[PDB]
Design a binder for this molecule. Structure first.
Ligand SMILES: [Cl-]
Ligand SMILES: [Cl-]
Ligand SMILES: [Cl-]
Ligand SMILES: [Cl-]
Ligand SMILES: [Cl-]
Ligand SMILES: [Cl-]
Length: 128
């Protein structure tokens, strides 16, 4: 049983690991974070920053969510992230991933009291 805030942490936070993800990082992390149970989650982004830094994004630049609804916020700073993409050849229960580390501003949807990230919306390179 999982709140949206807890689901966000499980799926998208990886505060305590190195930014330069090796080629097997997503294979290991998608499994460890329960994103290969029932189905292979096709795409996922992990953020290698402190929780407080990601939570604080809810109080940074307000931007439009990709679907035009909800309240989204773009980080002031470029953060260490890793994109994970399900390989073409993969099929449940065999879930293989390509790992792509990068530094990007994150855009998250926020809600609740406390007002916290509940959805990873997008990442972008450009500031402002
Ligand atoms: Cl950083
Ligand atoms: Cl790609
Ligand atoms: Cl990518
Ligand atoms: Cl999400
Ligand atoms: Cl980009
Ligand atoms: Cl792009």
């Amino acid at each position: 049983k999982e709140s949206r805030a807890k689901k966000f942490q499980r799926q998208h936070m990886d505060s305590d690991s190195s930014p330069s993800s090796s080629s097997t990082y997503c294979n290991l992390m998608m499994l460890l974070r329960n994103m290969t149970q029932g189905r292979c989650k096709p795409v996922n982004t992990f953020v290698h920053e402190p929780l407080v830094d990601v939570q604080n994004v809810c109080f940074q630049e307000k931007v439009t969510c990709k679907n035009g609804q909800g309240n989204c916020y773009k980080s002031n700073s470029s953060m260490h992230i890793t994109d994970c993409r399900l390989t073409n050849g993969s099929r449940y229960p065999n879930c293989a991933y390509r790992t792509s580390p990068k530094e990007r501003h994150i855009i998250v949807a926020c809600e609740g009291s406390p007002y916290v990230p509940v959805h990873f919306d997008a990442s972008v390179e450009d500031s402002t």
